[PDB]
Structure formats: structure tokens, C-alpha cells
Amino acid sequence: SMSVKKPKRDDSKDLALCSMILTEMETHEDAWPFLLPVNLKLVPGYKKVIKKPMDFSTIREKLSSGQYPNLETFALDVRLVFDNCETFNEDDSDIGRAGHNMRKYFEKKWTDTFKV
Ligand SMILES: Cn1cc(C(=O)NCC2(N)CCCCC2)ccc1=O
Structure with missing residues (x-):
């Protein structure tokens, strides 16, 4: 509360660590469905069904621009990238399994990097 400071973790390396994690994602073999925005004009249903689209390139732009x-x-x-993928794709489709694989891959790096 006011004048009662909770000790806080050092966040000064967060930008560079999130960038490294994103680089690992971008280079993963199963990243291809998520590297660019889904083409809203060429993919039936996506625009109406997926209320907040997201992809790695948009994340990279947002990270590089504060x-x-x-x-x-x-x-x-x-x-959000992987929630959207689960909403729109069958678990066993190529894109759907890629999303599941990428989610697990991400969460381990997240725990390994920040749950010190
Ligand atoms: C995450 N995601 C992606 C798609 C998609 O179209 N991805 C790329 C592709 N169509 C065009 C360039 C490489 C070949 C495949 C559809 C539904 C979805 O949920």
C-alpha cells in the first residue's frame, strides 16, 4: 500500500529474455502456421470467429517498439496465438498439433527462464 513497498524482482533483463524466447519460437520447425498474420481475405471464418488475431511477427513488432x-x-x-489456434483447428490437424507443440515449447522456456 501507500509507502509500503513490496520487494520486486529485477526486471531489467526482461526485454532481452523475451526476445530470445521469441527467437526460439520463430525458428522452431513447427512455427510456420504462426509466423505471419492469418490472411483474413483467404481463410474462411477466421475474421468473424477469431476476435483478437495474433502471430509471431506482430509480437516481434510490439516487442521491438515498446x-x-x-x-x-x-x-x-x-x-493468445495458441488459444486462437485451438479455437479454429482440430487437435490432430497439422496446424492444430503444431499449436499444441508450440504451447508446450513456450511454457517450458517461460518457467525455465523466469521461474528462477
Ligand atoms: C494459425 N492458423 C494459420 C492458417 C493458415 O492459413 N496458415 C498459413 C498458410 N495457409 C499460408 C502460408 C503457408 C501455408 C499455409 C489457418 C488457420 C489458423 O488457425
């Missing part, structure tokens, strides 16, 4: 206030908002956009 649009994430904290690491929690960065992980929200990452998780």
Missing part, C-alpha cells in the same frame, strides 16, 4: 509494458503482457500475446 508496446509490452511488462513480461506478463508479452506472455498473454504468446498464449
Whole structure:
């Protein structure tokens, strides 16, 4: 509360660590469905069904331009990528399984990097 300061973690490396994690995602073999925005004019249903689209390139732009206030908002956009993928794709489709694989891949790096 007012004048009662909770000790806080050192966040000074967060930008560079989130960037490294995103680089790992971008280079993963199963990243291809998520590297660019879904083409809203060529993919039936996407625009109406998926209320907040997100992809790695948009995340990279937001990270490179100071649009994430904290690491929690960065992980929200990452998780949004895979939530959208689950909403729109069958678990066993190529894109659907890629999303599941990428989510697991992300969450381990997140715990390994920040749950010190
Ligand atoms: C996350 N996601 C992606 C698509 C999609 O179209 N991805 C790219 C592709 N169509 C065009 C360039 C490479 C070949 C495949 C559809 C539904 C979805 O949920």
C-alpha cells in the first residue's frame, strides 16, 4: 500500500529474455502456421470467429517498439496465438498439433527462464 513497498524482482533483463524466447519460437520447425498474420481475405471464418488475431511477427513488432509494458503482457500475446489456434483447428490437424507443440515449447522456456 501507500509507502509500503513490496520487494520486486529485477526486471531489467526482461526485454532481452523475451526476445530470445521469441527467437526460439520463430525458428522452431513447427512455427510456420504462426509466423505471419492469418490472411483474413483467404481463410474462411477466421475474421468473424477469431476476435483478437495474433502471430509471431506482430509480437516481434510490439516487442521491438515498446508496446509490452511488462513480461506478463508479452506472455498473454504468446498464449493468445495458441488459444486462437485451438479455437479454429482440430487437435490432430497439422496446424492444430503444431499449436499444441508450440504451447508446450513456450511454457517450458517461460518457467525455465523466469521461474528462477
Ligand atoms: C494459425 N492458423 C494459420 C492458417 C493458415 O492459413 N496458415 C498459413 C498458410 N495457409 C499460408 C502460408 C503457408 C501455408 C499455409 C489457418 C488457420 C489458423 O488457425
